[PDB]
Design a protein around this ligand. Structure first.
Ligand SMILES: Nc1ncnc2c1ncn2[C@@H]1O[C@H](COP(=O)(O)OP(=O)(O)O)[C@@H](O)[C@H]1O
Ligand SMILES: [Mg+2]
Lengths: 11, 337
């Protein structure tokens, strides 16, 4: 996306 | 899916699962058979009491007005087959995978995640405040979340336009709101954002009061008891000022000591959010400019919004209160427009 996007969650 | 849940909507939809149930709203995911899209549908029974219909109307108008990444998108509202048979409102929206309350309670979030979540919340709050709208019900369960970490605010029925009822959860309520008869302010929303940020660091509500007195006691126990008249200027209600002078005299608790492992920049932002004096409380815009969020801050991509006049919620200002039937027509206008 727009840069250093956080790691995705497991939901 | 709870067989007791019934939606009077097109057979083209197939309910999938119950996502939320309350006295005001019921939310379920549902499949639109013809396209295969899975959506979220919020059912509301607005016509037993004006209060319910006013909330419905305020929520729908706000939803339709904003086109913002952090404000839940509304796809459409179901059209009843007739005015006589119009008894429930079904708001169709983009489906999110879960809410922030569920996340904070089932997951260990990194500092990065926290930055990204509070950043998005403040980003929605900024465009709201810039439009002269205050949410007033900001809390983790009203922050919708997806796997990729995108966040969107929902539940705008208790909003108000600046210058018997549904009450916001006391745990997130600003102290000037529980004390004085305080006029709606942008600062009250920031106070809630502070409790949310704190909730993200702690993984539990920072101020879970039992009631009104306990709430105040918990808040001051952390932010320090306002003592001098300089500190009490913001409070009108004389009764309120005397109650405050009866509390234990608490100093500001040292947040960084109590929670040594939280990013110091994060504690700094949090402290600026939980300030007693609403006039000295950081704004959503300044919060987005705080060092703790420099990783996601972008001054050219933070919608400021545009003023919405009070007449937008005109129906909230009648000498002679509007009847159920009046509001039904106003809601109908909204649906078919
Ligand atoms: N668009 C949506 N996508 C996924 N879940 C949603 C959506 N809207 C609401 N929900 C779920 O339903 C819950 C209640 O919705 P909310 O809009 O806050 O209504 P209420 O007025 O009943 O609190 C949320 O906390 C969330 O878990
Ligand atoms: Mg809600």
């Amino acid at each position: 996306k727009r840069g250093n996007i956080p790691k995705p969650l497991n939901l | 899916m709870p067989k007791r849940i019934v939606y009077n909507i097109s057979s083209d939809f197939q309910l999938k699962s119950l996502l939320g149930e309350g006295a005001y709203g019921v939310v379920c995911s549902a499949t639109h058979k013809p396209t295969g899209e899975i959506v979220a549908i919020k059912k509301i029974e607005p016509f037993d009491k004006p209060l319910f219909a006013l909330r419905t109307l305020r929520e729908i108008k706000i939803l339709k007005h904003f086109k913002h990444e952090n404000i839940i998108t509304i796809f459409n509202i179901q059209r009843p087959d007739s005015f006589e048979n119009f008894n429930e409102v079904y708001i169709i929206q983009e489906l999110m995978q879960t809410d922030l309350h569920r996340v904070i309670s089932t997951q260990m979030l990194s500092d990065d995640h926290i930055q990204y979540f509070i950043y998005q919340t403040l980003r929605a709050v900024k465009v709201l405040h810039g439009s002269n709208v205050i949410h007033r019900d900001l809390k983790p369960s009203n922050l919708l979340i997806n796997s990729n970490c995108d966040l969107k605010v929902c539940d705008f029925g208790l909003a108000r336009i600046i210058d018997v009822e549904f009450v916001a959860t006391r745990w997130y309520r600003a102290p000037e709101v529980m004390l004085t008869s305080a006029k709606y302010s942008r600062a009250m929303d920031v106070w809630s954002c502070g409790c949310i940020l704190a909730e993200l660091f702690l993984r539990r509500p920072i101020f879970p009061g039992r009631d009104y007195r306990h709430q105040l006691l918990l808040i001051f126990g952390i932010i320090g008891t306002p003592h001098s008249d300089n500190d009490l200027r913001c409070i009108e209600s004389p009764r309120a000022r005397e109650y405050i002078k009866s509390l234990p005299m608490y100093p500001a608790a040292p947040l960084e000591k109590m929670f040594p492992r939280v990013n110091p920049k994060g504690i700094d932002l949090l402290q600026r959010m939980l300030v007693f004096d609403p006039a000295k409380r950081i704004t959503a815009k300044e919060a987005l400019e705080h060092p703790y969020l420099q990783t996601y801050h972008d001054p050219n991509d933070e919608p400021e919004g545009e003023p919405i006049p009070p007449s937008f919620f005109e129906f909230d200002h009648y000498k002679e209160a509007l009847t159920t039937k009046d509001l039904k027509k106003l809601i109908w206008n909204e649906i078919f427009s």
